[PDB]
Amino acid sequence: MGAQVSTQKTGAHIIHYTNINYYKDAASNSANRQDFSQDPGKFTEPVKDIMVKSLPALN
Amino acid sequence: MGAQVSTQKTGAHIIHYTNINYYKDAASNSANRQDFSQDPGKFTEPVKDIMVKSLPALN
Amino acid sequence: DRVRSITLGNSTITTQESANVVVAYGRWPEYLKDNEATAEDQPTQPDVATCRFYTLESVTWERDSPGWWWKFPDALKDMGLFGQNMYYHYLGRAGYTIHVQCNASKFHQGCLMVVCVPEAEMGCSQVDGTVNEHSLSEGETAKKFASTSTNGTNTVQSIVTNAGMGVGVGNLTIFPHQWINLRTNNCATIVMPYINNVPMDNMFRHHNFTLMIIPFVPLDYSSDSSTYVPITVTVAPMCAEYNGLRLATSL
Amino acid sequence: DRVRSITLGNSTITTQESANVVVAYGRWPEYLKDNEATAEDQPTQPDVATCRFYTLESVTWERDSPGWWWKFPDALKDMGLFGQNMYYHYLGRAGYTIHVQCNASKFHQGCLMVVCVPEAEMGCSQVDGTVNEHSLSEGETAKKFASTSTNGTNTVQSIVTNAGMGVGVGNLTIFPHQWINLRTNNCATIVMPYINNVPMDNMFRHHNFTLMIIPFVPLDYSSDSSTYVPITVTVAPMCAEYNGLRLATSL
Amino acid sequence: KLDTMEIYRIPVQSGNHQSSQVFGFQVQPGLDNVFKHTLLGEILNYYAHWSGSIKLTFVFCGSAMATGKFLLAYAPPGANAPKSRKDAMLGTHIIWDVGLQSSCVLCIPWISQTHYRLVQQDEYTSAGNVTCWYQTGIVVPAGTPTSCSIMCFVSACNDFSVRLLKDTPFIEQSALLQ
Amino acid sequence: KLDTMEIYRIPVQSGNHQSSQVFGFQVQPGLDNVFKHTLLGEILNYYAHWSGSIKLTFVFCGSAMATGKFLLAYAPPGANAPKSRKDAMLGTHIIWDVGLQSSCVLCIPWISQTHYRLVQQDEYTSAGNVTCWYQTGIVVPAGTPTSCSIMCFVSACNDFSVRLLKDTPFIEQSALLQ
Amino acid sequence: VVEAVENAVARVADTISSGPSNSQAVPALTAVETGHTSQVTPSDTIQTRHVRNYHSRSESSIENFLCRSACVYMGEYHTTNTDTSKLFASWTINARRMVQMRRKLELFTYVRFDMEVTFVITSKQDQGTQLGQDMPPLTHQIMYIPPGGPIPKSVTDYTWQTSTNPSIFWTEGNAPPRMSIPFISIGNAYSNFYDGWSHFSQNGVYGYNTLNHMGQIYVRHVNGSSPLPMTSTVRMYFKPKHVKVWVPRPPRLCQYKNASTVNFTPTNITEKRQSINYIPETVKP
Amino acid sequence: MEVTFVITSKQDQGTQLGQDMPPLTHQIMYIPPGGPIPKSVTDYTWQTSTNPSIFWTEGNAPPRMSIPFISIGNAYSNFYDGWSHFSQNGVYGYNTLNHMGQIYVRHVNGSSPL
Amino acid sequence: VVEAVENAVARVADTISSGPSNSQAVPALTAVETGHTSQVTPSDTIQTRHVRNYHSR
Amino acid sequence: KSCPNPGEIRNGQIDVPGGILFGATISFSCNTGYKLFGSTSSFCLISGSSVQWSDPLPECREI
């Protein structure tokens, strides 16, 4: 009835849960604890020219 | 089971909610906070002949 | 690989021992687009009169010298037609290109940190007090850190190790930065987009960012190497808009 | 037919008794093209900060008042970001739109000539002498003709009938002009391209043209009509370039 | 003049009054005494943020034979109000010629950095100030009055919006049965 | 030297100093005073377990004409810290030649039995210790300074992870309004 | 069976670009004598840049504006007294004793809506010499007396049998008693205003009281008397749902005097400033 | 945000304790920047006609509600290197930017014997 | 009507094997003067065994 | 009128709460670890043919 069945957090080495929203406002939802994304090269490698990890950093 | 899944209020720059009515009377429903309509020309321009915003208001 | 040239407006910078170019967060300066904009009127975009290389006076790296900081803008406010549009207009937007230039021989040694800090809100010397504006920025004259804890009313607590913001001065590597290691390079370049939480923002009220130059490893030399080693800073706006024209401000 | 609106920059002019619009020689202001240009570097084109309607202070049309003249540029040199680019730049180019505004009732009568004169080189009062610069232009304060022959060193021979150039003041109809006949219209508009013999020319040295307002038929009114009739002049640059930037001039 | 209809009309006369400023007032459609009791102001004062542009329409209410031109200028904030027409000339202005079509609309555009502005405005979200000056003056024939009147109508443009409902400070009681 | 920038730089000089150890410190990225205030350490101290490997990058900050080779060794736990380069030689080491490319990365790998390690480390989940020794020494020509400096930058490899959120012990107050 | 409802969002109009102009189109000159409000977007008077405008006029619709609860009556009643008419509260229904919701509803001449009514009932032990007792939770009855029914004369009346009048029993300590009410009117809209009389001889009572007769409400303590006095206060909250409104009016300026009439004292239009030219100087070192 | 309130009463230490007071109920009003603020617990402002406010009767689960991104910038700015006035003076830093109003909590019941 | 949402789990990078090396590739020597943080996985400095790494950030 | 630039007390600090224009006072301090030998404050007064500073710059000498 407007549901959504997503996957639970299980470890690696009957796992689906159900969500329904009741309120008219997205500021009433749960938290988005299941988005895991990254882009460290933004802070780790913020340089104009690339550096290829097996060539001298200069030269 | 007699439901209706409408859209939430999100800003611009998982958004559907579910409604079911339980009572036998429409005076028991929620409020219609998601109808946005307008017609200002009723109060703003209540004149017999039109006025076209780039011609003199007279003449 | 070490040679480089940067042509902005009617100004050019040549360099022969450059390490690389930090682009702040992988992001280049750009103009305000139509869907992220909030002001109604048409902006000025002078484009060659304002987006060029303005050179601030240079500081002498001595053997015992803690560091220096400038605040941008309010450093380029008396520089040409950037510092004039910046007067006549309410709202301004621009990114920058900061080129720091310090050269020594092969018998000298040292290591500067060159770091741009967004919103570098600073802390007064008397904990229960308030900074001045002079104590945050002298224009093109740099303010100087101190090797010990400073005193005096209204003047930033400018011991180097805390960098005047209350953090550790070695963690500043989280901000866009470079080093000038007098054994490898002699210039650092940081390309800094417009980082702020509103599309355009006034230019006299908000010090959009702070440039700190902090020698971690100090100078040194032997028998008669050159005693005088200066540091010169050049800043060049990029993609500079202004909006909201009226009579000129005054301070 | 008599209504009109002129929108330039962030400025608008509304009028309801306009006669027409003189476009100087059928020619509209335009930018310097690539094959008629002589300067190498890229020009500034601010386009909305400088091409707007700047209003000069207004003069009182009295019953016995010979006339008035302004010199453009050097009238708009203290007007906003036209008078600032004009300082920081060596070479400048621009056309204009002159709107002269004088309104009276239906019980008043008169007739002004509104005439733009290119290169209105003027003649001193002592025939064997030299004008000042003040005697050619006061900025936004108009200079005034005289109903008789003037004396005094360095001051233009400003008897009206010769218009200070040695010609007949009725032949000025060869220049782009209009009249303000207080029985028909109450504003004159002249659109003036860049008329000069070099592509771009300095803005402090050369008074590119002269605006003369000369009442041929004087004011008049009866029992208690309004005694005060002012004239207001508005000028708006158009297609304004500058070239050759350096530190600001001074006078 | 606060309980007089005279509060509504701006005085304008004929003669050499070019040095004098006709009127001037801050742009504060929810807080300035000039605005806070209009329809725009009384509707805003039920909300806490407001964005959009405003339309101020001026109506010349003198003889059918009086003639004048006026300058109506808006100055985005950043510097003290203009004190001469050479400064007001530099703003966002209009030159209104008085003729058959009596009234003239100065549309205060939306120049701001924040998408919105408080209704209880401070000097962070200040909005500017408008000012009016003679451009040529009033000229009347013989036998017509010299002292005329203007009037100013405020409305919101088609991109106005208000948000964050609040209570209005304009109504208040001291017991039930009121 | 704790409130001096001198805390950041390791002293290194020229001469027969092969018997002397340059530096040495435990691997405790959340508890050792050397680490607990870095970005790595201050980010760990919000968590209770940490796994992964670490990258320590050393920067020679002397003349452009000084030359030396250094030995940088990591010793997985099980035995007291090495007290001579013949023992550090047996560890997991690297020999860094000082030249054009100034800096050199010693990547402390993840050797452990438990998949994770506490941040408040004990001698069960100990991690080891790193130590640095001259391999050949520093050699400088005439007219350059003899006392140079190294510096060490810590970061986490691309397989690091932390878990079990906790509070950080580094911030503390004694009343509200702080 | 699930049904998808479509809800369109109403943004405000974007700013189209513009350039120089030299024409006989005067979008500024107009004539207010026609009772017509000029439509001059900024792009007609100056040079504007294209601005995609995402703002919405949602929180200003009539439903979003009015559908918020507000108190409309406060009344006290005692468990024990020596008056027997202070043992229960009673009042005729109108939204007109509290200035806030009154003034809010009175921007329109005819308002037609349902309501959601809530009651906040809070007892306190009366200050005295000998306090201290074990009284059980108080329970209250709220009866609605339509226009015509018999009204109570004591808290032990027969009328409180509420055979057909609706009434609520609520035992203190739970969530407030709320119910919903249709458009209970005989006109086709609640008329906030009325310029007329009741009698055809053009006399009688003037204005609102004529039209709207919606009956009374009577609240009481069901429990019984009390060893030591206690006093309860009931506040009633109206929240209009499904709101339709017609013929807007200028908001009230002068303060309200009574709930019967629109009588007032004359007030100033607005407050003063120094001159007509006065703008304060705020850019100052 | 998700805002929660934990409200816990205690009987004040004194000489004559002992009383039968009923459960206390509390009102939590949010005053946006501009609204009128109370001057007593018997003010008119507590009518909360448009300000949101919560009544909670002690003994239940804590009062919780949810709050959108109520800001005028495009992000809450923890830091701010600037002033409020354009003359480069005024107040420095955070206080300039963020004005989110006040909160006022009260006991609805009334006074108390002790 | 039920909707299936896809939630991807982000593991951390495995350890690829390695062997002896004798080459002009120096994955260790770098230059921090560029404001760039060396990406030297252990498999670049020593001999590592292939390790499937299931940990998650 | 503007007094000449105050200067720079090394191992110390200059606090100018109101500019350097006529009649403006400035204060002098020394960092932690130095004693201030000299004047504490300096005003912008009239000096013969200009406006200059009341007192010269002091010295922060090591404790």
User: What residue ranges do the domains of chain D occupy?
Assistant: 1-251
DSSP-derived secondary structure letter, E37: T
Beta carbons within 10 angstroms of residue D216's beta carbon = 14
Structure tokens given for B30: 């929620």
Task: Report the candidate in H3, H29, H24, H31 with the shortest Cα–Cα distance to residue H108.
Answer: H24
Nearest to D16 among E17, E93, E97 (CB): E97
Beta carbons within 10 angstroms of residue I46's beta carbon = 13
Identify any residues that bridge with D13 across adjacent strands, giving them in sequence order. Answer: D6, E95
Structure tokens given for B47: 């004149």
A2 and B16 within 8 Å at the Cβ level: the answer is yes
G49 and C250 within 8 Å at the Cβ level: the answer is no
Please, which residues 78-137 of chain E have a Cβ atom closer than 8 Å to chain G?
Answer: 78-81, 92, 94, 96-97, 99, 101-107, 109-110, 115, 123, 126, 129, 131
Give the C-alpha distances (Å, rounded to integers) separating C161 from C218, E113, F3, F44, I17. Answer: 14, 36, 6, 22, 42
Cα G213 to Cα E109: distance, rounded to the nearest angstrom: 49
Residues of J in contact with C152 (CB under 8 A): 13, 15, 27-29
Structure tokens given for H84: 């409020």
H3–A contact, CB cutoff 8 A: no
Q: Are F120 and F44 in contact (CB under 8 A)?
A: no
Q: Determine the distance in angstroms separating the CA of C92 from the nearest CA of chain D, rounded to an integer.
A: 14
Q: Are F32 and F26 in contact (CB under 8 A)?
A: yes
* Residues with Cβ within 8 Å of residue B8, at least 6 apart in sequence: A21, A23, A24, A25, A26, B15, B16, B17
Q: Are E40 and E175 in contact (CB under 8 A)?
A: no
Transcribe A21-42 into DSSP letters.
Answer: --SSBGGGS---TT-----GGG
Residues of D in contact with E90 (CB under 8 A): 54, 79-80
Q: Are F108 and I45 in contact (CB under 8 A)?
A: no
Residues of B in contact with G54 (CB under 8 A): 11-13
Do chains D and F meet with 3 or more Cβ pairs nearer than 8 Å?
no
Q: Are D16 and E104 in contact (CB under 8 A)?
A: no
C119 and H81 within 8 Å at the Cβ level: the answer is yes
H20 and G133 within 8 Å at the Cβ level: the answer is yes
* Residues with Cβ within 8 Å of residue D117, at least 6 apart in sequence: D165, D172, D175, D209, D210, D211, D212
Q: Where are the alpha helices (DSSP H) in chain G?
A: 62-66, 99-105, 208-211
Cα C119 to Cα C121: distance, rounded to the nearest angstrom: 6
The nearest alpha carbon in chain I to F59 belongs to I32
Touching G (3+ Cβ pairs <8 A), the chains are B, C, D, E, H
Q: Are J50 and J22 in contact (CB under 8 A)?
A: no
| Three-class secondary structure of residue C225 per DSSP | coil
A42–C contact, CB cutoff 8 A: yes
Do chains H and G meet with 3 or more Cβ pairs nearer than 8 Å?
yes
Torsion of Cα atoms, H50 then H51 then H57 then H62, to 10° = 130
Residues of B in contact with G64 (CB under 8 A): 33
Cα G156 to Cα G163: distance, rounded to the nearest angstrom: 15
Structure tokens given for H65: 């509600």
D41 and C85 within 8 Å at the Cβ level: the answer is no
Task: Report the candidate in D193, D172, D196 with the shortest Cα–Cα distance to residue D237.
Answer: D193
Interface test with A, best of C20, C97, C171, C174 (most A CBs within 10 A): C20
Q: Determine the distance in angstroms separating the CA of I8 from the nearest CA of chain A, rounded to an integer.
A: 8
Query: CB pairs under 8 A, 24+ apart, for F120-128?
Result: F120/F30, F120/F31, F120/F48, F121/F28, F121/F30, F121/F31, F126/F77, F127/F26, F127/F27, F127/F28, F127/F77, F128/F26, F128/F27, F128/F74, F128/F75, F128/F76, F128/F77
* Residues with Cβ within 8 Å of residue E170, at least 6 apart in sequence: E36, E37, E42, E45, G251, G253
Q: Are J38 and J57 in contact (CB under 8 A)?
A: yes
Q: How was this structure determined?
A: cryo-EM
C159–G contact, CB cutoff 8 A: no
Give the C-alpha distances (Å, rounded to integers) separating I12 from A36, C9, C182, G225. Answer: 11, 46, 38, 73
Q: Determine the distance in angstroms separating the CA of E146 from the nearest CA of chain D, rounded to an integer.
A: 7
Do chains J and A meet with 3 or more Cβ pairs nearer than 8 Å?
no
Q: Are D124 and D157 in contact (CB under 8 A)?
A: yes
Cα G177 to Cα G195: distance, rounded to the nearest angstrom: 37
Give the C-alpha distances (Å, rounded to integers) separating G21 from D12, D52, D232, G46, G267. Answer: 9, 12, 21, 9, 47
Angle at G42 between CA G36 and CA G44, to 5 degrees: 75
Q: Are A54 and I26 in contact (CB under 8 A)?
A: yes
Q: Determine the distance in angstroms separating the CA of C116 from the nearest CA of chain A, rounded to an integer.
A: 13
Nearest to H25 among G98, G122, G137 (CB): G122
Cα F38 to Cα G257: distance, rounded to the nearest angstrom: 69
D15 and E97 within 8 Å at the Cβ level: the answer is yes
Phi, then psi, of C246 in degrees rounded to 5: -160, -170
Site of tokens 């771009």:
D200
Site of tokens 């958004």:
B15
Identify any residues that bridge with J40 across adjacent strands, giving them in sequence order. Answer: none
H68–A contact, CB cutoff 8 A: yes
Q: Are D38 and D185 in contact (CB under 8 A)?
A: no
Torsion of Cα atoms, E112 then E114 then E117 then E118, to 10° = -140
C184 and I36 within 8 Å at the Cβ level: the answer is no
Q: Are F112 and C188 in contact (CB under 8 A)?
A: no
Task: Report the candidate in J6, B58, H52 with the shortest Cα–Cα distance to residue G34.
Answer: B58
H55 and G120 within 8 Å at the Cβ level: the answer is yes
Nearest to I31 among C19, C176, C177 (CB): C19
Q: Are C204 and C251 in contact (CB under 8 A)?
A: yes
| Three-class secondary structure of residue G76 per DSSP | strand
Touching I (3+ Cβ pairs <8 A), the chains are A, C, F
Touching B (3+ Cβ pairs <8 A), the chains are A, E, G
Return the sign of the alpha-carbon dihedral for residues C242, C243, C247, C251: negative
Whole-angstrom distance between the N-terminal and C-terminal Cα of chain E? 29
G23 and D4 within 8 Å at the Cβ level: the answer is yes
Residues in chain A that come right before a backbone break, where C and next N are over 2.5 Å apart: 13
The nearest alpha carbon in chain G to D13 belongs to G45
| Three-class secondary structure of residue E5 per DSSP | helix
Q: Are E138 and D107 in contact (CB under 8 A)?
A: no
Please, which residues 81-100 of chain H have a Cβ atom closer than 8 Å to chain E?
Answer: 84-86, 96
Q: Give the total number of structural domains in chain J.
A: 1
C251 and G15 within 8 Å at the Cβ level: the answer is no
Residue type, I7: N
Torsion of Cα atoms, G28 then G31 then G35 then G38, to 10° = 0
Angle at C156 between CA C152 and CA C162, to 5 degrees: 120
Task: Report the candidate in G233, G270, G278, G229 with the shortest Cα–Cα distance to residue G253.
Answer: G270
Q: Is C225 exposed, middle or buried (0-12, 13-18, 19+ CB in 10 A)?
A: middle
C133 and H89 within 8 Å at the Cβ level: the answer is yes
Cα G59 to Cα G154: distance, rounded to the nearest angstrom: 46
| Three-class secondary structure of residue D56 per DSSP | strand
Structure tokens given for C60: 């002498």
Write out the E strands in chain G: 2-4, 21-23, 29-30, 70-78, 88-92, 108-125, 139-145, 167-171, 178-181, 190-191, 216-221, 230-248
Q: Determine the distance in angstroms separating the CA of G54 from the nearest CA of chain D, rounded to an integer.
A: 24
Q: Are F115 and A12 in contact (CB under 8 A)?
A: no
Q: Are G119 and G236 in contact (CB under 8 A)?
A: yes
Task: Report the candidate in E56, E15, F6, D150 with the shortest Cα–Cα distance to residue C169.
Answer: F6
Residues present in chain H in total:
114
Q: Are D141 and D58 in contact (CB under 8 A)?
A: no
Write out the E strands in G165-284: 167-171, 178-181, 190-191, 216-221, 230-248
H73–E contact, CB cutoff 8 A: yes
Touching F (3+ Cβ pairs <8 A), the chains are A, C, I
Structure tokens given for C66: 């803690």
Angle at G270 between CA G265 and CA G272, to 5 degrees: 120
Cα C71 to Cα C3: distance, rounded to the nearest angstrom: 29
DSSP-derived secondary structure letter, G246: E
G108–E contact, CB cutoff 8 A: no
Query: CB pairs under 8 A, 24+ apart, for H69-77?
Result: H69/A27, H70/E164, H70/H100, H71/H98, H72/E49, H72/E114, H72/E115, H72/E116, H72/E117, H72/E118, H72/E125, H73/C197, H73/C198, H73/E114, H73/H97, H74/C197, H74/C198, H74/C199, H74/E115, H75/C197, H76/C197, H77/C119, H77/C197
C195–D contact, CB cutoff 8 A: no
Give the C-alpha distances (Å, rounded to integers) separating I3 from A16, A28, B3. Answer: 12, 20, 16
Q: Are C116 and A46 in contact (CB under 8 A)?
A: no
Helix-, strand-, coil-residue percentages of chain D, each rounded to 5: 5, 35, 60
User: Phi-psi region for residue F59, left (φ > 0), alpha (ψ -120 to 50) or beta?
Assistant: beta
Cα I41 to Cα F54: distance, rounded to the nearest angstrom: 9
User: What residue ranges do the domains of chain B occupy?
Assistant: 1-59
Q: Are C182 and C104 in contact (CB under 8 A)?
A: yes
Site of tokens 């310097």:
D32
H or E segment to which residue F55 belongs: strand F54-60
Counting one residue from chain C and one from chain J, the pairs whose CB atoms sit within 8 A come to: 42
Cα A57 to Cα F101: distance, rounded to the nearest angstrom: 7
Q: Is H54 exposed, middle or buried (0-12, 13-18, 19+ CB in 10 A)?
A: middle
Q: Determine the distance in angstroms separating the CA of C172 from the nearest CA of chain E, rounded to an integer.
A: 30
Return the sign of the alpha-carbon dihedral for residues G142, G148, G153, G157: negative
Cα A42 to Cα C176: distance, rounded to the nearest angstrom: 10
Transcribe C45-94 into DSSP letters.
Answer: ---SSSSS-EEEEEEE--TT---EEEEESSSSTTSTTHHHHHHHEEEEEE
Q: Are H80 and G95 in contact (CB under 8 A)?
A: no
Structure tokens given for F7: 């805390």
Q: Is I39 exposed, middle or buried (0-12, 13-18, 19+ CB in 10 A)?
A: buried
* Residues with Cβ within 8 Å of residue D143, at least 6 apart in sequence: D68, D69, D70, D135, D136, D137, D156, D158
User: What residue ranges do the domains of chain E occupy?
Assistant: 1-178
Q: Are C154 and C131 in contact (CB under 8 A)?
A: yes
Q: Is G6 exposed, middle or buried (0-12, 13-18, 19+ CB in 10 A)?
A: exposed
Q: Are E61 and E149 in contact (CB under 8 A)?
A: yes
Beta carbons within 10 angstroms of residue E66's beta carbon = 23
Cα E2 to Cα D240: distance, rounded to the nearest angstrom: 49
Cα C109 to Cα C9: distance, rounded to the nearest angstrom: 35
Return the sign of the alpha-carbon dihedral for residues C191, C192, C194, C197: positive
Residues of H in contact with G283 (CB under 8 A): 85-87
Give the C-alpha distances (Å, rounded to integers) separating H90 from C228, G118, H87. Answer: 41, 47, 8
Torsion of Cα atoms, G30 then G32 then G34 then G35, to 10° = 130
Nearest to E120 among H33, H72, H85 (CB): H33
Phi, then psi, of C174 in degrees rounded to 5: -75, -20
Give the C-alpha distances (Å, rounded to integers) separating C171 from D187, F39, F155, F156, F157. Answer: 68, 6, 11, 14, 18
Give the C-alpha distances (Å, rounded to integers) separating F36 from D68, F3, F48, F130, G249. Answer: 81, 16, 13, 16, 68
A49 and C20 within 8 Å at the Cβ level: the answer is yes
Q: Are C194 and C29 in contact (CB under 8 A)?
A: yes
